[PDB]
C-alpha cells in the first residue's frame, strides 16, 4: 500500500543552551534533548515529528521508540492516525499511562500528521481546526536563578523584541524575593502588559495562597502550576481562596488527567503539550475537552509546533519558550504585530535544519 | 563514607515463558523482561533490586537507569533511602509521574532496601512492618486464550499444587464465553475455594456491570480492573450497581493515583506493585494509605518479593503470578499449608541465580 509505513528513523540530539536556564523544581539546564522521528512510507513520502526534554529521558524515549514501538508500526497504514494512536496507547500500556511512553507516542504521532498535511496539501493550523493562523504570544523566561538586574534586562529584551506579554519563574526559598521580583517587573513593564507567573509546582497549597494574595495587586493574568499537578483538589483549595486565575497542563500526559483538571482543579487556563500528551492527536483530544469547558487553550514549549495548534483554536496563549528549538528549524518563530504566525506550508510547519544539528547528534 | 554508593550495575534479561500467556488488553506474551540493578557501596556491600515487564520497556527502563538516574546516585549515601527516593521523583519528574520512570526508581529503591536489610541483619518482612511472615496466596493464571479444557486442567494443577484460591482472566469478545468459563470453574473447584476474576481493563462500565450481575451467583471474591484504571468514577459507577467487590492497583504508579482510588474508586481490595510504584519505599507509602482506609493490601506479580510485603501488613492476598521470576532466584516461592512464606534471610529475600539467567542477558 502506498501509505504503508516502510521505515521509521529516530535520532537523538543534545543541544547546548547558550546560557543556563533555571527553575525551582527542574533545577538547572545546560542543554536540552531533541528526539526526531522520521517516517517513510512505501511510495517514498516522509514525515518528521519530534519531542524534547530539558536534558533527561532522551536515551530512554529513543530506546522506547526503537525497541518497543517502531518495530510494531512497520507495515501499518500511516493514513490511520487515530487507529495507530490507539494501537500505541494499549501497546505500551503496562509501561505507559504517561511518562516516557507519551513522549515516544508524540514523536510518532506528529510524524504522521506531517505526512497527512503533506498528503492533503494542508498546513497544520488548517487540519487542527482552522479558526485562525495567528495567536497571542508571551515570553516564558526560565529565569529563577537570575539576579533581579539580569531579569529586568532580559524582560526588556522581550518587550523590545516585539512581544507584549511575559512570564517569569517563581519559587525562590525566600518568598519575599519572589514578591519583590514580581513587583519589580510590574513597575518595569507598566500597566499595559500581560504578566504571568510560573511556580513549577514548587509550592504548598498554603504557600501558593500566601503568595497569590501577596502579588495580586500587580494584575497577574495567571498563576501556573502553583503546587503538585497531581493534587487537583489542592488547586481547587488554592483557587477558592485567591483571585489570580490558575493554569496547568504541561505535565499532564493523558486525556484522563485533563478530565481531572477540568472536573476538579478549577483552572482558568489549560496547557496541553503536544510533545508529551500524544502528539497532535492527543493534543486535539485535550483541546476539545478544554474547549467544552470554555477554558482558553494554551501551550508551553515548542513554539514552532504549537503556534499552529493555538491559532487553530484561537482562544489561548502561545508560550515562546526559552529552548530555542525553532532556531534549528528552517523557520524560527515569526512574530508580526505582537502575534505569533503559523506557516501555510503543508505539513506540521516545522522542517529541521539537519545540517545545523548534525553536530549535536548522539 | 562506608555506605556511599560506589557503583551501580544494571542488566537486562529476556526470559522465555515455557508457554504463551494471554490477556484481553496486554495481548499475548512469549517472554518477559527482567531488569536487575546491583548497587555497590564503598565498603563493598552489595544490594540488588529489580523490575519486570511482560516484554516491552526493558531497553527503555534500562536506558533510564544508565543515562538519567545512576550517574546521579554515585556518591550519594545509600542509607538515606527516603531522601534518594525523593531525589529521583523530582530528578525525572518532567519525564516521570509514572511510566518508565517508576519502574526504574523501583529497581533502584529495592536495591537500597536489600542493602539496608543486610546492613541491619533484618528480613524484608520485618523492616516492612513485621505483622506476620506468611500470607494468603492465590494463583493468577494469565489464561484468556486457553480452551476451557486447558483452563480447567490448569486450575486443577493449582489446587493440587497446594493452593486454595484462583484467579482467571476474563475479557473475551463474547461475554457469554466469560460467563460460561466462570461457571465452569466454580463447578470444578466447589464452594470452598476463593475465586477471583480479572478483566484487565478490557470492559466498559456498562459491560462490567452486565458481567458482574451475571456471575455474582458463583461467589466471586473480587473483580479486578473491570474498566480503565484512570476512570476512577467509572469504578464507583460499577461498584454502586454490583455486588462483587472491585480490585485495582497494579497499574497505578504514583501515590497520588492511590489517593484517587481510595477517595473515588470505591474499591474492596487494592493492589500496589512494588516493581512499578517506586520500589519498597513507594509500596509502603501506598500500603499505609490503603490501610488508613481499612482496605486489604494485596499485590500482583513478583511473588518472591511481595510475599514479604503482604505478610508484613497481614491483611491481603498475594498473587502467585505466571511469570516464574522466583524460579530464577535461589528460593522459588515457598508454600506451606496454603500460605506463601517469606524468607528470614536478611535483605529483600531474593537472590538471583546469575548462572541460570546469564544465558538470557541482553
Ligand atoms: Mg510551568
Ligand atoms: Mg512543555
Ligand atoms: Mg489485573
Ligand atoms: Mg504487577
Amino acid at each position: 500500500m502506498k501509505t504503508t509505513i516502510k521505515d521509521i528513523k529516530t535520532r537523538l540530539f543534545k543541544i547546548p543552551l547558550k546560557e543556563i536556564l533555571s527553575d525551582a523544581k527542574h533545577g538547572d539546564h545546560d542543554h536540552f534533548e531533541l528526539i526526531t522521528t522520521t517516517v517513510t512510507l512505501e511510495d517514498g513520502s516522509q514525515g518528521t515529528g519530534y519531542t524534547y526534554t530539558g536534558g533527561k529521558g532522551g536515551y530512554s524515549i529513543k530506546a522506547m521508540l526503537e525497541y518497543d514501538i517502531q518495530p510494531a508500526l512497520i507495515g501499518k497504514d500511516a493514513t490511520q492516525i487515530e487507529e495507530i494512536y490507539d494501537f500505541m496507547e494499549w501497546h505500551i500500556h503496562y509501561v505507559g499511562r504517561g511518562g516516557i511512553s507519551t513522549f515516544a507516542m508524540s514523536a510518532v504521532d506528529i510524524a504522521l500528521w506531517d505526512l497527512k498535511g503533506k498528503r492533503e496539501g494542508l498546513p497544520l493550523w488548517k487540519m487542527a481546526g482552522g479558526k485562525n493562523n495567528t495567536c497571542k504570544a508571551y515570553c516564558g523566561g526560565i529565569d529563577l536563578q537570575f539576579p533581579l538586574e539580569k531579569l529586568l534586562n532580559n524582560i526588556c529584551g522581550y518587550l523590545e523584541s516585539g512581544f507584549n506579554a511575559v512570564k517569569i519563574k517563581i519559587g525562590r526559598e525566600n518568598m519575599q524575593e519572589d514578591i519583590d521580583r514580581i513587583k519589580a517587573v510590574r513597575e518595569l513593564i507598566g500597566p499595559d502588559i500581560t504578566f504571568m507567573i510560573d511556580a513549577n509546582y514548587s509550592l504548598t497549597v498554603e504557600q501558593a495562597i500566601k503568595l497569590s494574595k501577596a502579588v495580586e495587586q500587580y494584575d497577574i493574568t495567571w498563576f501556573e502550576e502553583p503546587t503538585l499537578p497531581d493534587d487537583y483538589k489542592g488547586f481547587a483549595e488554592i483557587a477558592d481562596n485567591t483571585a489570580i486565575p490558575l493554569a496547568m497542563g504541561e505535565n499532564l500526559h493523558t486525556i484522563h488527567e485533563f478530565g481531572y483538571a477540568m472536573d476538579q482543579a478549577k483552572l482558568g487556563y489549560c496547557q496541553p503539550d503536544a510533545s508529551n500528551c500524544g502528539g497532535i492527536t492527543g493534543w486535539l483530544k485535550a483541546a476539545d475537552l478544554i474547549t467544552e469547558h470554555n477554558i482558553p487553550v494554551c501551550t508551553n514549549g515548542m513554539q514552532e509546533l504549537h503556534v499552529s495548534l493555538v491559532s487553530a483554536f484561537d482562544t489561548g496563549w502561545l508560550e515562546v519558550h526559552s529552548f530555542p528549538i525553532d532556531e534549528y528549524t528552517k523557520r524560527p518563530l515569526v512574530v508580526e504585530n505582537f502575534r505569533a504566525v503559523a506557516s501555510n506550508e503543508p505539513g506540521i510547519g516545522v522542517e529541521f535544519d539537519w545540517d545545523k544539528i548534525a553536530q549535536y547528534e548522539v
Side-chain angles (χ1 to χ4, degrees), chain A:
Chain A
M1 186 145 40
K2 282 179 40 176
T3 55
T4 278
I5 296 167
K6 184 188 176 171
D7 189 34
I8 311 182
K9 175 84 199 193
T10 285
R11 307 181 178 91
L12 176 55
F13 298 90
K14 279 175 176 305
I15 302 182
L17 300 164
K18 69 175 169 184
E19 200 193 3
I20 272 79
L21 270 45
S22 46
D23 68 57
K25 289 282 283 220
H26 296 144
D28 300 286
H29 311 267
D30 80 296
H31 74 276
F32 68 101
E33 285 167 333
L34 181 69
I35 292 81
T36 59
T37 284
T38 311
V39 171
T40 305
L41 305 194
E42 212 158 31
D43 65 13
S45 303
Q46 287 204 307
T48 290
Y50 64 109
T51 191
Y52 72 104
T53 75
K56 325 188 186 68
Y59 292 82
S60 185
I61 297 168
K62 175 163 176 303
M64 253 285 214
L65 291 168
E66 275 174 337
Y67 294 93
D68 306 319
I69 286 173
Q70 289 178 212
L73 300 174
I74 304 298
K76 294 205 193 288
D77 179 20
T79 59
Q80 310 306 300
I81 292 189
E82 264 277 5
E83 292 77 6
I84 299 171
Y85 177 87
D86 185 78
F87 164 88
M88 293 175 73
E89 155 139 14
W90 307 118
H91 189 88
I92 45 78
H93 187 272
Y94 189 71
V95 287
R97 302 185 66 258
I100 287 293
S101 86
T102 40
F103 289 80
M105 290 172 53
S106 293
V108 164
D109 182 86
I110 294 160
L112 297 187
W113 284 83
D114 193 43
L115 282 164
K116 170 196 182 51
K118 292 168 186 174
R119 194 162 56 253
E120 301 183 6
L122 283 189
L124 172 58
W125 69 263
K126 256 183 184 306
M127 334 184 94
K131 291 226 224 300
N132 195 346
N133 71 331
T134 57
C135 56
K136 293 177 299 193
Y138 71 94
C139 288
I142 318 178
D143 41 31
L144 188 63
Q145 287 297 342
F146 290 4
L148 179 63
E149 35 280 12
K150 198 195 260 170
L151 178 60
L152 300 162
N153 289 341
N154 209 251
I155 290 171
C156 208
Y158 292 156
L159 296 189
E160 294 177 353
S161 282
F163 300 87
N164 66 1
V166 284
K167 181 172 67 175
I168 77 169
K169 304 299 202 167
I170 54 189
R172 296 216 161 182
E173 295 303 314
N174 181 14
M175 183 163 278
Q176 189 56 44
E177 280 167 32
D178 293 319
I179 306 183
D180 289 348
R181 306 177 96 210
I182 290 181
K183 170 189 99 181
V185 172
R186 182 42 93 188
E187 286 179 17
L188 174 57
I189 75 191
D192 289 342
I193 295 184
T194 307
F195 188 9
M196 301 84 151
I197 56 186
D198 179 8
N200 287 109
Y201 48 87
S202 47
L203 305 190
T204 60
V205 167
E206 262 83 1
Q207 281 167 321
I209 296 176
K210 178 160 302 183
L211 175 67
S212 185
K213 296 175 136 156
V215 300
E216 62 184 36
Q217 42 169 351
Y218 304 109
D219 182 42
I220 305 308
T221 293
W222 69 67
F223 185 11
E224 187 174 332
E225 309 196 272
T227 198
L228 299 196
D230 317 83
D231 186 11
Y232 302 106
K233 298 167 103 183
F235 272 71
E237 195 168 354
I238 293 176
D240 280 345
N241 295 288
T242 50
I244 310 165
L246 296 184
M248 172 195 73
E250 173 181 42
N251 289 136
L252 306 182
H253 301 310
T254 282
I255 184 46
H256 306 116
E257 308 193 295
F258 278 109
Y260 309 152
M262 299 302 98
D263 278 324
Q264 305 164 37
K266 299 210 186 87
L267 311 178
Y269 300 79
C270 199
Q271 304 163 311
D273 191 335
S275 72
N276 60 67
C277 66
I280 291 150
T281 293
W283 195 90
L284 291 169
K285 289 188 72 199
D288 280 334
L289 183 63
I290 290 154
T291 310
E292 295 315 300
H293 283 67
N294 307 320
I295 278 170
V297 173
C298 320
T299 54
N300 297 16
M302 251 193 175
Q303 53 258 42
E304 72 294 334
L305 197 269
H306 281 134
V307 56
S308 293
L309 298 172
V310 179
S311 300
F313 273 60
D314 193 36
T315 56
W317 287 84
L318 171 89
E319 179 192 62
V320 175
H321 196 235
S322 290
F323 297 165
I325 300 173
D326 60 293
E327 302 265 289
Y328 296 93
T329 81
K330 293 179 147 272
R331 180 197 171 94
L333 193 73
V334 168
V335 181
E336 294 295 309
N337 193 240
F338 299 100
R339 293 180 65 97
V341 180
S343 173
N344 280 331
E345 205 99 26
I348 49 168
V350 186
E351 214 85 42
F352 290 101
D353 181 17
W354 301 107
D355 297 314
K356 254 187 74 177
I357 71 173
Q359 53 181 311
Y360 303 123
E361 175 171 29
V362 171

